[PDB]
Amino acid sequence: QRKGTDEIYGLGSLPSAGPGRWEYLANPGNWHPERRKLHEKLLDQARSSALTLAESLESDGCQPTLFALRGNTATGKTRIATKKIPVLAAALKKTAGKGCVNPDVFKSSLAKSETGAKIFSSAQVHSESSFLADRFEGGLRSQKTGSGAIASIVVDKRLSREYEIDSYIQLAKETGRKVELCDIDAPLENSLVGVLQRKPEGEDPRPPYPVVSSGFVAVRSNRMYVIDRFIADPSLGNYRLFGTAEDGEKVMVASVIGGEFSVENAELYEKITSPQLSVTDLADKVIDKELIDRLENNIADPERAAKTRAALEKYSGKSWSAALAAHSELI
Amino acid sequence: QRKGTDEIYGLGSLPSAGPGRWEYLANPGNWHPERRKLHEKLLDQARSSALTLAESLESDGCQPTLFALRGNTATGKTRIATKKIPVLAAALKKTAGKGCVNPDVFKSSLAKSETGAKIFSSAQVHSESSFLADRFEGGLRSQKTGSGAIASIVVDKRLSREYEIDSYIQLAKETGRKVELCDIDAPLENSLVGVLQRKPEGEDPRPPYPVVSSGFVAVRSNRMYVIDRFIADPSLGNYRLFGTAEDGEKVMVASVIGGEFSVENAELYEKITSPQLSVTDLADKVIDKELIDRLENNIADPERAAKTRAALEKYSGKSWSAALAAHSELI
Amino acid sequence: MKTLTGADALEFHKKLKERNKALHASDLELALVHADAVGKERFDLEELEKICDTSDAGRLTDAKERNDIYERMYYVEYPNVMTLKEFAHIVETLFSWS
Amino acid sequence: MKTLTGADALEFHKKLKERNKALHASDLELALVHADAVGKERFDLEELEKICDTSDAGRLTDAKERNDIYERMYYVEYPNVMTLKEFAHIVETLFSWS
């Protein structure tokens, strides 16, 4: 569909859609009362989940920390958090994964609008979900636990660009939080098939091709800037970069831990700090039998191989761009 | 086998094998008389073929020219000469392809040694064949046709490096020949499968992996230096670069013709002027069903597809390095 | 493989930064030549900012980072896009998603 | 695609030369760091020239081109080769073929 929920549920003369439309809508009172109520309910839920996370982390001895999960769409971020950040894995278990700062966590609820079925598309609810995420993050800034300590929080966003990274470092510095950053990379094609595997009945986003490609370019091009921040300031926190081997498994590539910088996989480090651009397109590559076989050849896990296969076959004969476009349009 | 023919048929205390061993053997009289006779016979044949080429070219109005076919092993050089250099195609028809400066043209004869069967390997005859090629080229330098004009000649060698290119430009300048240079590129994998398709009953060389890979690196890394020579000096002659599209067909990529420099395919030009190296190997890639299917997916011609398939299947389960090594060892 | 540590890790990082910086600049330089050659509309941030929001809701306020993000995207990532009006649709798509 | 002509072709060529020069230097710089890290034998042309012929039969006489060819090959093309004695076998193989 077409009209955004910010336009449908906003009240009055809506400011032309660039910012100016944000402060207007950033004011929780330019919305219809029913929508205002939905916002309050969703923020209460998210805040409850975040506090559960924070109390779990503190009980497990974690100093106030901003856990940042950097990386492009469908690169395996969730599995890395689960396996490689044990204290956070323990916390997320208690909330079934809820409580992280991420606009996408509000999308399903906004899309269903308490009616029992999804009636708005992800794109239709995105601005509103972003507004809620910003209000959610704002309240978390100085949120305390029961011991009066600053609450640890989790930021689950692409975090590709310098300005975003700087902003979260500044937030951490101002609130006395360490930054624990895991940066997760996969080849662009892995993200594309990852998106096609996400089912609309799930809550993981299904963006169109340009989002995944531009995200890939941005995350790779700005990666070394992020690493430089940790190399320069040992007190900032810790950094780990995981990349994807040929067989699809994640491996440590570079790290800054306790101020010590190491490169665990120099070959991958050279590769995953560059977008592999040329003057003129993976977007036009057709999903054919060969491509599916080519991807299957490097997937050994039966369940993963079957799911990859099924997702691709649904779009057999279409270009990556056409495939992700069609997949994204599903409600 | 192991002992080279220069050692078997050379006379006396052979100088340690780097040059010094060349002038010794460059003297046609440090060889056994029978071998001396074979040399004379092969040079007479090659010279006859070269004169036929030269007289054909002159009759077709070609000014004295050095036709240089630059490019790595098994990149499609012969087909390009046949299709894209019509005057030379007409000449080569008259000699069934013989008469070009290339050590490989002597290898079959040296390997059979007038016995009726190949009893020496290509590697065993290479030094001797190189010696003959140099004597052949030396005599061609000031060779005249029946009109007294300098004979046009064809140099069919990789011609990868600056020193080689400089040497042939100097030869052309000193002998009043134009340089007509066609530079032919294919992806490294195309050269590897090209080598595996060459049958030992043929006379085209079957080198091991390092020859093809190092040749690829050299030809690409020094390509723009060659182009610069033609951009700088319109009087030198003409330059055309052909590269390989995804479907295996050759296309014009860049050219310097009548002093005018154009880039017919900028995407390919960016690609084929660089070796695509990383800090750590196509040599270890295993020829499996997927790889064969992957290569077959981009070959539409039935005969070519079948031959590519058959050559690869013979080495199924082996790495590219192991496959070319085994293939090279065949007599 | 062997982990690079200490001075070797730092030097690898330094040299890799140089490499990627050269590649970064080169991608844009080459794209601009090709753009001129095919008649692609000259990048105009202000005209762009008329037809779409480049602000990321006021988070991106640095003029230097803002021009550099979109000019580079326009030329390097979308070479077949000829107009800023076309590119506008792309940018809008990008901010419709996380 | 559209053929680049005249000034555009020349500028593309110039910028591409710069790109490839940066890549050329970078490949060697990175390879040297990795070589130091793993204990690869230091490249020694003279020791090399004891165990094999780098002359291409006296065609290659420039000392600058000769060192630069083999040092770069040693470090960039054969990173897993640890010794000049090993590399010698490679070089000999190369001159056993056209």
Q: Does B277 touch chain A (CB under 8 A)?
A: no
CB atoms within 10 A of CB A54: 26
Distance from CA of A234 to the nearest CA of B (A): 29
**Is the separation of the CB atoms in A58 and A152 below 8 Å?**
yes
Which region, left, alpha or beta, applies to residue B237 given φ > 0 means left and ψ of -120 to 50 means alpha?
left
- Label residue B115 exposed, middle or buried (CB < 10 Å: 0-12, 13-18, 19+): exposed
Give the integer Cα–Cα distance in Å for A246 and B283: 16
- Tell me B284's DSSP state: G
Give the integer Cα–Cα distance in Å for B253 and B269: 6
CB atoms within 10 A of CB A81: 21
Which residue type, as a one-letter code, is found at position B75?
T
Give the integer Cα–Cα distance in Å for B74 and B71: 9
By DSSP bridging, strand A260-262 and strand A250-257 are antiparallel
Spell out which residues of chain C touch residue B270, defining contact as CB-CB under 8 Å: 30
Nearest to A279 among C30, C52, C53 (CB): C30
**Is the separation of the CB atoms in C98 and A205 below 8 Å?**
yes
Spell out which residues of chain C touch residue A136, defining contact as CB-CB under 8 Å: none
Contact: B266, C1; criterion CB under 8 Å: no
Contact: C16, D30; criterion CB under 8 Å: yes
By DSSP bridging, strand B250-257 and strand A65-70 are unpaired
**Is the separation of the CB atoms in B104 and B205 below 8 Å?**
yes
Beta bridge partner(s), residue A250: A244
| Residues of chain B in Cβ contact (below 8 Å) with chain C | 266, 270, 280
Give the integer Cα–Cα distance in Å for C51 and C84: 9
Buried b or exposed e, range B160-179, using 16+ CB within 10 angstroms: bbbbbbeebbebbeebebbb
Give the integer Cα–Cα distance in Å for A45 and A35: 15
**Is the separation of the CB atoms in A307 and C50 below 8 Å?**
no
Distance from CA of A299 to the nearest CA of B (A): 13
Distance from CA of D57 to the nearest CA of B (A): 5
Would you state the structure tokens that stand for residue D45, as one six-digit string?
Answer: 């042309």
Contact: C15, D26; criterion CB under 8 Å: yes
By DSSP bridging, strand B153-156 and strand A178-184 are unpaired
Would you state the structure tokens that stand for residue B264, as one six-digit string?
Answer: 């017919």
- Label residue B146 exposed, middle or buried (CB < 10 Å: 0-12, 13-18, 19+): exposed
Would you state the structure tokens that stand for residue D10, as one six-digit string?
Answer: 């020349």
DSSP A233-297: -GGGEEEEEEEE-TTS-EEEEEEEETTEEEBS-HHHHHHTTS-------GGG-B--HHHHHHHHT
Beta bridge partner(s), residue B244: B250
Give the integer Cα–Cα distance in Å for C9 and D30: 11
Distance from CA of A60 to the nearest CA of C (A): 31
Edge-to-edge, what's the strand order for the sheet holding A237-244? A153-156, A65-70, A178-184, A237-244, A250-257, A260-262
Range of the domain at C16: 2-98
**Is the separation of the CB atoms in A4 and A128 below 8 Å?**
yes
CB atoms within 10 A of CB B260: 13
Does an H or E element contain C24, and which?
Answer: helix C6-38
C-alpha closest to that of B127 among D56, D49, D87, D85: D56
Would you state the structure tokens that stand for residue A274, as one six-digit string?
Answer: 């560059």
Contact: A270, D1; criterion CB under 8 Å: no
Give the integer Cα–Cα distance in Å for B67 and B175: 14
Outline where DSSP puts E strands in chain B.
65-70, 153-156, 178-184, 237-244, 250-257, 260-262
Give the integer Cα–Cα distance in Å for B274 and D30: 17
Give the integer Cα–Cα distance in Å for B151 and B103: 20
Using CA atoms in the order A319, A322, A325, A330, what is the torsion angle rounded to 10 degrees?
-100
Give the integer Cα–Cα distance in Å for D5 and C80: 19
Give the integer Cα–Cα distance in Å for A248 and A244: 6
What percent of chain D is helix, strand and coil (3-state, nearest 5)? 65, 0, 30
C-alpha closest to that of D10 among C50, B302, B36, C33: C33
Does an H or E element contain C47, and which?
Answer: helix C45-51
- Label residue A66 exposed, middle or buried (CB < 10 Å: 0-12, 13-18, 19+): buried
Give the integer Cα–Cα distance in Å for A230 and A179: 9
**Is the separation of the CB atoms in B320 and B192 below 8 Å?**
yes
Would you state the structure tokens that stand for residue B154, as one six-digit string?
Answer: 């064809």
Give the integer Cα–Cα distance in Å for A242 and A260: 17
Give the integer Cα–Cα distance in Å for A297 and A312: 14
C38 → chain D, closest CA residue:
D2
- CA triplet A155, C21, A266: central angle to 5 degrees? 70
Give the integer Cα–Cα distance in Å for D70 and D82: 14
Would you state the structure tokens that stand for residue A316, as one six-digit string?
Answer: 């057999």
- Label residue B116 exposed, middle or buried (CB < 10 Å: 0-12, 13-18, 19+): exposed
Length in residues, chain B: 331
Give the integer Cα–Cα distance in Å for A151 and B249: 62
Resolution in A: 1.6
Phi, then psi, of B179 in degrees rounded to 5: -105, 120
**Is the separation of the CB atoms in B280 and D79 below 8 Å?**
yes
CA distances from D65 to A60, D61, D69 (A): 63, 8, 6
* Chains with at least 3 CB pairs less than 8 angstroms from chain C: A, B, D
DSSP three-state, residue A38: helix
CB atoms within 10 A of CB B40: 11
Would you state the structure tokens that stand for residue D94, as one six-digit string?
Answer: 């190369």
CB atoms within 10 A of CB B248: 18
Give the integer Cα–Cα distance in Å for B45 and A127: 81
Give the integer Cα–Cα distance in Å for B216 and B212: 6
CA distances from B44 to A101, B37, B39, B106, B132 (A): 83, 11, 8, 12, 11
Which region, left, alpha or beta, applies to residue B317 given φ > 0 means left and ψ of -120 to 50 means alpha?
left
Does an H or E element contain A155, and which?
Answer: strand A153-156
DSSP D30-79: HHHHHHHHHTPPPP-HHHHHHHS--STTTT---HHHHHHHHHHIIIII-T
C-alpha closest to that of B197 among B287, B71, B106, B306: B306
Would you state the structure tokens that stand for residue A163, as one six-digit string?
Answer: 């300005």
Give chain A's end-to-end CA distance (angstroms, integer). 10
Listed in sequence order, the residues at least 6 apart from A201 whose beta carbon sits closer than 8 Å to its beta carbon are none
Contact: B22, D57; criterion CB under 8 Å: yes
DSSP D10-39: HHHHHHHHHHHHHHHHHHHHHHHHHHHHHT
Listed in sequence order, the residues at least 6 apart from B85 whose beta carbon sits closer than 8 Å to its beta carbon are B67, B180, B182
Outline where DSSP puts E strands in B220-328.
237-244, 250-257, 260-262
Which residue type, as a one-letter code, is found at position C55?
S
- Tell me D58's DSSP state: T
Which residue type, as a one-letter code, is found at position B331?
I
Which residue type, as a one-letter code, is found at position B119?
I
Give the integer Cα–Cα distance in Å for A208 and C93: 8
Q: HSE (CB half, 13 Å, CA atoms) of A239?
A: 30
Nearest to B267 among A270, A279, A288 (CB): A279
Would you state the structure tokens that stand for residue B260, as one six-digit string?
Answer: 């005018």
Give the integer Cα–Cα distance in Å for B274 and B188: 12
CB atoms within 10 A of CB A31: 20
CA distances from B181 to A3, A6, A256, B174 (A): 62, 65, 52, 17
Listed in sequence order, the residues at least 6 apart from A202 whose beta carbon sits closer than 8 Å to its beta carbon are none
Which residue type, as a one-letter code, is found at position B201?
E
CA distances from B169 to A154, A272, B155, B227 (A): 66, 42, 12, 12
Q: Which residue has the tokens 């695509």?
A: B276
**Is the separation of the CB atoms in A301 and C42 below 8 Å?**
no
Using CA atoms in the order B217, B219, B224, B228, what is the torsion angle rounded to 10 degrees?
150
Give the integer Cα–Cα distance in Å for A179 and A152: 10
Pairs of residues, one from chain A and one from chain C, whose beta carbons lie less than 8 Å apart: 102
CA distances from A51 to A58, A92, A140, A251 (A): 10, 11, 9, 32
Count of domains observed in chain C: 1
What interhelical angle do A188-197 and A209-221 show, nearest 10?
A: 140
Residues in A 284-313 with any Cβ partner in B closer than 8 A = 288, 290, 293-294, 297
- Label residue B300 exposed, middle or buried (CB < 10 Å: 0-12, 13-18, 19+): exposed
Listed in sequence order, the residues at least 6 apart from C29 whose beta carbon sits closer than 8 Å to its beta carbon are D15, D18, D19
Outline where DSSP puts E strands in A18-79.
65-70
Give the integer Cα–Cα distance in Å for D37 and D75: 13
Q: What was the elucidation method? A: X-ray
- Report CA B319 to chain centroid distance, whole Å: 25
